[PDB]
Write a protein that binds this DNA or RNA. Structure first.
Lengths: 245, 190
RNA sequence: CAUCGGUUCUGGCGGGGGGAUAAAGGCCCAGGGAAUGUGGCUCCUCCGGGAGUGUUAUAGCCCUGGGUGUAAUACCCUCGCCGGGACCGAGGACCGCGCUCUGCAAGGAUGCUGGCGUAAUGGUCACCAGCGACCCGUCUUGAAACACGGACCAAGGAGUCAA
RNA sequence: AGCGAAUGAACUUUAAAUAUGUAAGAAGCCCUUGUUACUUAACUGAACGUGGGCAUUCGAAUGUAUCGACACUAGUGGGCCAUUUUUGGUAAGCAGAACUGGCGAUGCGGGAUGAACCGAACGCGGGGUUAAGGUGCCGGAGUGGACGCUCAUCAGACACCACAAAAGGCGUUAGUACAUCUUGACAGCAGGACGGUGGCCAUGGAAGUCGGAAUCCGCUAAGGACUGUGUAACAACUCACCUGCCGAAUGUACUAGCCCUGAAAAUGGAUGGCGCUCAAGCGU
RNA sequence: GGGAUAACUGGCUUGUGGCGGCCAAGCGUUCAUAGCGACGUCGCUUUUUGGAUGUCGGCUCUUCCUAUCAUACCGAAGCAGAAUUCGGUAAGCGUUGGAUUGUUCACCCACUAAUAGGGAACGUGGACCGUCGUGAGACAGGUUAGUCCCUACUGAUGAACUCGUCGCAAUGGUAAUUCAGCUUAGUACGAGAGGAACCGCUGAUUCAGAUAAUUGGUUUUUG
RNA sequence: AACGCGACGAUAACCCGCACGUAGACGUAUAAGAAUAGGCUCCGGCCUCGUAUCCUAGCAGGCGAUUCCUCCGCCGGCCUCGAAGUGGCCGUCGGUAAUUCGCGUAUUGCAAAGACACGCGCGGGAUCAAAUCCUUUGCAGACGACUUAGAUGUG
């Protein structure tokens, strides 16, 4: 009838992918199943996956898929009756959460030797426990919020003072410089944005983002493999405790 | 379409005591007393679990089912206010004339009075009276910020809205004159 | 008031016929099927309550064919019987048609009882009440609307007489 | 209707409806035979005479409060409106014919009221039953029954058009056609939103985002030589798109009802009034 | 000279032109093509250098509408302040002249807060005829056309309810307007030139209702 | 509001004479408030329903018993009722089928003018308490109307 929200059409080039992207991902995974030897599965639980492009470049030999998990489960074959190879329906029992596949031809020991050695500091996603009490000083607010010494710090942009105020900080600007209390200093107390052991919600995650502070570690957990010759699977370490269905 | 049945759920925590006489719902908790009358809508109130209130409409239209969703959150807001409370942190900023704020709790009728001076140099005192049940204190953590606290969300939000409206600039450009008192933080006590 | 006649209004009852000799339905007999799935069984936040499996078990339902069965009932048509009320009584020897024939409800109301003369029943006036209801004549016009006459009463007053 | 009949409204085997001319016996028919003043090649026609049958179905139905001829005698010789058909015209009104009907010389019931609407025609009375119209009160008669719809900041109200549109309505209900969906629909939240490439021209500057043109490719799960905010340019935020969490139906365009708006002046006033909201409104 | 309509409007009127082309959802003779066709856009009017008004008035007064000029309130604008501009709610309260003119408007000038526009059956205080003319014209030519009642309201009285005193208040009318000065303040704001407002205080115009101490005016106290 | 209402002050009891006795009674009986997607309550339970609850026998309702302390009414006494004003309790007195009887009711025939007592008023006169006219006043006046004053005084 009536009293309904008006859909905002987007005058933009990129449109919905729909059914054609479904079968194309089905086709590429099937076409890569008999090409490579070992089928690896990895999990990235609550981390930004912007460095997954970096593991694309370094592992230029391999072929690594990370999309919808139910599609990747149906592509490998959930039941033992319908599948592309033996033991592939054991991997579909592994694919539960945010997971991806990794087809490789090299020695299996060399792969989790790399993935144990991979470590890059990342911005914390919402829900993790904060490992440090970070705090902007009570005076003029800089770009990094006092992480670097202020003698080597640049002041924060004036356009961010909308977003800093909206995210919760009681900040002002005097004479074009964004300051928390007085321009010289003192006056106010300061803003502590996260505590020890507090679960980080959305807003302080965004505050750590624009202040360029990283409070988390990006590591990708390898779960298991299936071999084309051997035909069976082995749980590496991760799926022993990780919920699986 | 005359829907036969529609129901909704209000969970109640362990430290509460809710009572519904006819539609007069009262929630008693750690923070105090809350009470409101909902006789203007036809709702069937029942208990269906250990700590679950049930609210049902029988043989209703779309607007009768939609009236159950608004009364779900009003009662839930009464549950939140009597458990956790509501806090509004308003902040007053000025360019040249420093706005002065004084809060005194009046002996009769028990209502806080917030009186405001020197709003762009005006000589008029602006006395705004808070609703019965909301407490106003000058914040000592941050400069030039007011904190309104209370159990009734409607009372604390109306008292905050009354302060913003009374210090409104008139006949002057609002792109140049940014003086006023504005709500900044809006959440709970705990 | 009783017994009648004419008209009329309104209640109740006994039959008959018809439709798919209603369609249904109850109780049987035989075959089939399903879930808004009975009991059972498994899982099952156990006064309790959900999920799944499985065709009558400790519930039942649907579809088809047959019997009771020419079943009942609804609906439509129809042959009658009894009660309650109102309005009316025209005509004045016999004759006619009839019938249940020692006379009848058959070409129109009799029988019985009571009331009525210091008033039965009427009249006129005044007024109240409900409903109704433009001021007459003339003239114009399709018509209204205009227009002319009307202060009131009595007497007079206008198609006549000759060829 | 057909053209598996022919031919092609102007086609037809057949044939409408619907109004509208003409006949349906005895005062009638046919032919035979004669004449004429008429006519024709000619009783070929017209008229005058001749013959017959059927008078107890004499040649459809229905009705028939008589019909016709002659003579004599009064009053009349206007129109208005509507339906249908039809001729012409306008921006729209409108003008003219023909038929029928109403009013004219006509009372009564109803439409609150009334020349033109609906019902129905008239002695004086009693009884019964209806029509048109009504049954909340004024007002006789239902606050009758069944299923829905509608809330109007002067709704609507029973027998009717213009303003008025391919119009505006985050009002409400019903329906139609396409599309997505446990291969997790739309909405939300958590995130990614890359690399050649600060792509080429312009130029203090212009890196996606003042302009002109082009608008390609790798990784993909996806990502535009960019939807907006922004900067002097940057940066940063965002959208398109994509993934994780939840979990079941959605969402686009039209259609039909009822409702709002779709233009209003000026003494105070009108569904007839009161008033009516699961109506005392609207459809059956 | 003959014929024909007794006469006009009464859900009339207002703000957005016409013509041709392109596009076009729908409907239709059988289908968006027999064709009807809005919103836009294109061509013409129309572009590259900045006077118009005939009979009328003129004034007061009453009442109403709003289509609002001012005064109150808000929304928007590079709206810094000041001054404004556009729009919306609003009829409570007010609402000019002068020059010029036949008269008005337009324009110009002055004052003011502004000196808006309308309605009130558009409020209350010849008509031929005759005579002579006929290329046109007339007529000291004619006669004729062509209207004091009732009542509402207000004021003052008023019969009856025993006279008189003190009251209540249904209903009806209803009233206040606009400007300025002091302080805020030479302050916010501003490069400068300039330049507010709220609270508080004091006057003035108009309007309404009273009054005669004082100051004018008037003298059937004829002092 | 001259056809709305209230509080208050002072009145009109005598005597003589005479004119008449329902815009609709017939048991003219019945106080919670409040909600209606709830409420009442003996705290047992109850609610569609006023289809309820009180009263109701007796010559138009007699007389006398047997028998009963129930109901009704009048006066007080003490208190209560004020939105446009009443009931309660106690005491006296009068009446009183909750049970059972006896003596009357008739021929007004099957439904359709006597006496006594009490009110409402008229027509006289006498007894009150006022108002108006009268004379003065000028706070008032078109004329009515209005403010005063006139009975011994503060005239």
């Amino acid at each position: 009838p009536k009293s309904k929200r008006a859909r905002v059409y987007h005058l933009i080039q990129v449109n919905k992918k729909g059914r054609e992207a479904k079968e194309r991902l089905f086709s590429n995974i099937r076409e890569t199943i008999p090409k490579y030897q070992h089928c690896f599965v990895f999990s990235v639980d609550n981390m930004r996956n912007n460095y997954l492009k970096d593991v694309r470049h370094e592992l230029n030999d391999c072929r690594i898929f990370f999309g919808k998990t139910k599609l990747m489960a149906r592509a490998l074959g959930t039941t033992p009756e319908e599948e592309q190879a033996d033991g592939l329906h054991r991997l579909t029992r592994y694919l539960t959460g945010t997971v991806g596949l990794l087809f490789t031809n090299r020695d299996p020991a060399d792969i989790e030797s790399y993935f144990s050695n991979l470590s890059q500091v990342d911005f914390a996603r919402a829900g993790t426990v904060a490992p440090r009490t970070v705090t902007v000083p009570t005076g003029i607010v800089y770009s990094t919020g006092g992480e670097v010494p202020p003698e080597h710090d640049v002041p924060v942009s004036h356009t961010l003072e909308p977003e800093l105020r909206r995210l919760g900080m009681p900040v002002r600007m005097i004479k074009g410089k964004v300051c928390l209390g007085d321009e010289k200093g003192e006056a106010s107390e300061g803003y502590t944005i996260c505590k020890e052991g507090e679960v980080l919600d959305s807003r302080q995650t965004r505050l750590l983002k624009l202040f360029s502070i990283c409070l988390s570690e990006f590591k990708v957990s390898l779960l298991g493999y299936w071999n084309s010759a051997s035909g069976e699977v082995t749980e590496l370490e991760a799926g022993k405790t990780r919920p699986k269905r | 379409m005359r829907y036969i049945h529609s129901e909704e759920t209000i969970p109640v925590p362990e430290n509460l005591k809710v009572s519904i006489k006819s539609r007069l719902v009262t929630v008693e908790g750690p923070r105090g007393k809350l009470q409101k009358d909902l006789s203007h809508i036809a709702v069937n109130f029942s208990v269906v679990k250990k700590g679950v209130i049930g609210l049902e409409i029988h043989h209703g239209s779309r607007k009768d089912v939609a009236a159950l969703r608004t009364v779900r959150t009003i009662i839930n807001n009464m549950i939140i206010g009597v458990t956790k409370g509501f806090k509004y942190k308003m902040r007053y900023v000025y360019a040249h004339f420093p706005i002065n704020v004084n809060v005194e709790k009046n002996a009769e009728t028990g209502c806080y009075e917030v009186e405001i001076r020197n709003f762009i140099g005006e000589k008029i005192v602006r006395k705004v009276v808070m609703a019965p049940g909301v407490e106003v204190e000058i914040s000592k953590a941050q400069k030039d910020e007011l904190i309104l606290s209370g159990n009734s969300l409607e009372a604390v939000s109306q008292s905050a809205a009354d302060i913003q409206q009374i210090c409104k600039v008139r006949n002057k450009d609002i792109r140049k004159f940014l003086d006023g008192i504005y709500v900044s933080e809006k959440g709970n006590i705990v």
